[PDB]
Amino acid sequence: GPKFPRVKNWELGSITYDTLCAQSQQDGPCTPRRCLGSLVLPRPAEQLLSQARDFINQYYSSIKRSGSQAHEERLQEVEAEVASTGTYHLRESELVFGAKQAWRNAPRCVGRIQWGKLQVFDARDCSSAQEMFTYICNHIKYATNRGNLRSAITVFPQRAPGRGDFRIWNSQLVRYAGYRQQDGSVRGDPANVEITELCIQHGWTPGNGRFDVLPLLLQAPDEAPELFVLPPELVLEVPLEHPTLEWFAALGLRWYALPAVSNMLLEIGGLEFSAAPFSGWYMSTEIGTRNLCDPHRYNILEDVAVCMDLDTRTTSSLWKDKAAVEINLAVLHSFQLAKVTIVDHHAATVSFMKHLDNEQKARGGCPADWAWIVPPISGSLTPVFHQEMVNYILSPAFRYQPDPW
Amino acid sequence: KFPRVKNWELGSITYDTLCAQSQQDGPCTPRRCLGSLVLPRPAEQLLSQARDFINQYYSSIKRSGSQAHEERLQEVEAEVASTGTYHLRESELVFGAKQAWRNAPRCVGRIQWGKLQVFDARDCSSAQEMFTYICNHIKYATNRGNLRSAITVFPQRAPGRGDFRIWNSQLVRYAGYRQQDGSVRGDPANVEITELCIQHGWTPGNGRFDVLPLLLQAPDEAPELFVLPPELVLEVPLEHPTLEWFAALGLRWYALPAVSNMLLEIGGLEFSAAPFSGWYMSTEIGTRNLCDPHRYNILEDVAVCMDLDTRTTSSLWKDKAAVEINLAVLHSFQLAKVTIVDHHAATVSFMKHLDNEQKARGGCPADWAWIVPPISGSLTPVFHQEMVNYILSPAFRYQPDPW
Ligand code: HEM
Ligand code: HEM
Ligand SMILES: Cc1cc(N)nc(C[C@@H]2CNC[C@@H]2OCCNCC(F)(F)c2cccc(F)c2)c1
Ligand SMILES: Cc1cc(N)nc(C[C@@H]2CNC[C@@H]2OCCNCC(F)(F)c2cccc(F)c2)c1
Ligand SMILES: C[C@H](O)[C@H](O)[C@H]1CNc2nc(N)[nH]c(=O)c2N1
Ligand SMILES: C[C@H](O)[C@H](O)[C@H]1CNc2nc(N)[nH]c(=O)c2N1
Ligand SMILES: [Zn+2]
């Protein structure tokens, strides 16, 4: 082998070299002195043009037209535009290509075997917060497809010089309210306290439940954000029940069908889309393990263990483990019952192995964040645990961005 | 320069300043992270690693800058200047071994770092003598079930000649025997070492749990074969709290986790045979050893016994059976009165260790993928704790198989 990362699968004994990483144009947070790979957050003119050039090259390569008349004219067209305005504009098919490429390039998504199937909705004509609401509601209608979920992304207008951003304030399109109490405890989802408080300040009359759907705070450039309420018929939800444990349904737990991230930046060839929400379908463990068992979230492990009649007095009864399995199973069982798309952590990780194999043949590598790809239960029971991965930033990219308040 | 380390369960924040004392480079660059890779791939150098360690020593017994410090530093110059190398005093080696454990980023058990019986075997000259030493280490460390962490330090490396080595990866391992049907009986990880044993003339059992012999190598000698007296090797029959059938699986594990193939570096000196042992954390046996597909791979057998649905993965039979096997192990070890710690207790103590280290040193090098357990990851507080990883010395390094 050569001076590219050597990558081993310890279950199978198979070796690959990552040559794609050579493509990376942006430094991550690690150095030879220290690995910072487990931090969740780390941290004009020529600079723009070069990025733009790189993306157009990428576009043209993908349509197999590298070096050609139209390829070189488009380059000259992009330069022209940046020369007289300082920015430029993607073509319809260039946006489609990029959006998909950003999903392909996201090191933290286990669901990338699906990268090539993605409805790109162009909303770069959107002009008001009201119009955003509309656009967002069409997205939710399309993507939900009555439970037969379909991956999509709606792209609003790119950042402009000295001009405000289009922003969705909500971290996801569909999230539950969290209400701070007299006790100090939270009723609802403790992640969402702040945004809940922001909505009430902007005129929302709040509910008082564990599962109230948040309204949307949407922001057209240079105005303050307007508040929009999703019609309940538009938000599909799955009441939670267990297959064998009959009491589970009595807990009154539930989750929403559509996982739609809404607070991420989509950066394509230097252009920045501050508002471009995307959505797919859940992996069982996101709801069952993270949302419902995290001590700083709904934290239902104790409750369920008690119902199950486990010894919660001692760690070694593996009461946390026993309960978490049933919650997870209750998630899957119930989504399946309601005929709403879900994938379990086994099935998912199997298919990402397949994605890894594809991307090896196609690009010679696949950036991947191990701690994020490996599921929060039953880790080494899934094939990804035994797979070494290389993490690196590629572009187009989805980039986290700070809350707008 | 100083990285911010947040914990997302509680929202608390620290800064790691400890990582600045790292002198040895890891595998990451700013262009790409390789932190999930299991493996990497003259007087000035040695003399400055040695001073820096002696500094670490006198500083640790508060005598930094005193007479005994100055003259010991000079004893080091003098020895390297004349011989190309030098030797450590017993107390120094004791300090360095504990520090090597402390510095081990992949060890979730570091709360215990200061409690370590150090056996000095540097006066070892034969594979015979090696064996006795190893046999004493086992008797000490096992202590009829009341496990005591220990290390034994064989003679250092030397430019003149070959290394003292223990060919085995652990002092106690189960043999893996390749069958005709291209199948493995026993432990598939130990196929190659089992074939080495047999080649150096061992008579093999044909059970699923046959304790391998030791292959011990003195400098520039053919390794020698030594059978462990069966009474030294404490084993644990596996049974289940509620499932009476489990015991009839005939499953079992050994008490003592004792790594023997890792090189111990202190002050630039290299100890190529320095086995060490503590006690197990249950997921090691229950999850990895027994349910890994390239190991004993018993998940399906056990789930079928549990009468679950193998046909589809959304019934979570892998997870369900995985838990019972971990349960069986805990129960069994607690029943046989043998130290073991579950992943919840251990990760809780690791958090506290992170706290103590923060106050004492300004951080703790940690490797997230190894600290987080292989089941119920996010169920443990380590999952939500950011972690910085970097190499401090004294350290344990991984080493090439001697063959
Ligand atoms: C198609 C079904 C999909 C599944 C099953 C899936 C699965 C996942 C999972 C389990 C995570 C870990 C997130 C967490 O625990 O917070 C993740 C992250 C991510 N996914 Fe997906 N994903 C899917 C589709 C998509 C789509 C359509 C996009 C956008 C085109 C996308 C882009 C991302 C990004 C950017 C992350 C990192 C998120 C962050 O850093 O906050 N994924 N995915
Ligand atoms: C006191 C009981 C101990 C517990 C519960 C414990 C726990 C663990 C665990 C779970 C691992 C990862 C194991 C794996 O999945 O391969 C590990 C790794 C390690 N531990 Fe410990 N440990 C203990 C004692 C020790 C001792 C006594 C030493 C030596 C002084 C030590 C030094 C190391 C080193 C160097 C590694 C890296 C493993 C490797 O690179 O293969 N630990 N520890
Ligand atoms: C603080 C911070 C930084 C960052 N980069 N990222 C986050 C999202 C956090 C991470 N962990 C939980 C939460 O993110 C919740 C959303 N995660 C992904 C998902 F569930 F919404 C999803 C699932 C399938 C498909 C899809 F398109 C989206 C937070
Ligand atoms: C190839 C390779 C590289 C490397 N760095 N390391 C290895 C040891 C492997 C890793 N994964 C399992 C196996 O190592 C055997 C077990 N490792 C730790 C332990 F079990 F030995 C242990 C537990 C508690 C206390 C204690 F002292 C020791 C292999
Ligand atoms: C500190 C650690 O990186 C953090 O808890 C991460 C670990 N892995 C994760 N993996 C996924 N998919 N989602 C997460 O939120 C996290 N949290
Ligand atoms: C490829 C991956 O890094 C490898 O499987 C690691 C992951 N985490 C681990 N963690 C521990 N404690 N022990 C291990 O052997 C491993 N294996
Ligand atoms: Zn790294």
From Swiss-Prot, chain A:
Keyword Transport on entry: no
UniProt-recorded name of the protein: Nitric oxide synthase 3
Gene Ontology, cellular component aspect: caveola; cytoskeleton; cytosol; Golgi apparatus; nucleus; plasma membrane
Gene from which this protein is expressed: NOS3
Range of residues in the leader sequence: none
Function: Produces nitric oxide (NO) which is implicated in vascular smooth muscle relaxation through a cGMP-mediated signal transduction pathway. NO mediates vascular endothelial growth factor (VEGF)-induced angiogenesis in coronary vessels and promotes blood clotting through the activation of platelets.
Recorded GO MF terms: calmodulin binding; flavin adenine dinucleotide binding; FMN binding; heme binding; metal ion binding; NADP binding; nitric-oxide synthase activity
Region of interest (Interaction with NOSIP), ranges: 34-405
Binding site for (6R)-L-erythro-5,6,7,8-tetrahydrobiopterin: S38, A371, W372, F385
Swiss-Prot/TrEMBL GO biological process terms: arginine catabolic process; blood coagulation; cellular response to laminar fluid shear stress; mitochondrion organization; negative regulation of blood pressure; negative regulation of extrinsic apoptotic signaling pathway via death domain receptors; negative regulation of leukocyte cell-cell adhesion; nitric oxide biosynthetic process
Binding annotation for heme b: C109, Y400
Record bears the keyword Heme: yes
Location(s) in or outside the cell: Cell membrane; Membrane, Caveola; Cytoplasm, Cytoskeleton; Golgi apparatus
Homology family: Belongs to the NOS family.
Residues of the full protein shown: 67 to 482 of 1205
Annotated residues for binding of Zn(2+): C30, C35
Keywords from the UniProt entry: Blood coagulation, Calcium, Calmodulin-binding, Cell membrane, Cytoplasm, Cytoskeleton, FAD, Flavoprotein, FMN, Golgi apparatus, Heme, Hemostasis, Iron, Lipoprotein, Membrane, Metal-binding, Myristate, NADP, Oxidoreductase, Palmitate, Phosphoprotein, Zinc
Ligand binding (L-arginine): Q172, W281, Y282, E286, N291
SUBUNIT field: Homodimer. Interacts with NOSIP and NOSTRIN. Interacts with HSP90AB1. Forms a complex with ASL, ASS1 and SLC7A1; the complex regulates cell-autonomous L-arginine synthesis and citrulline recycling while channeling extracellular L-arginine to nitric oxide synthesis pathway.
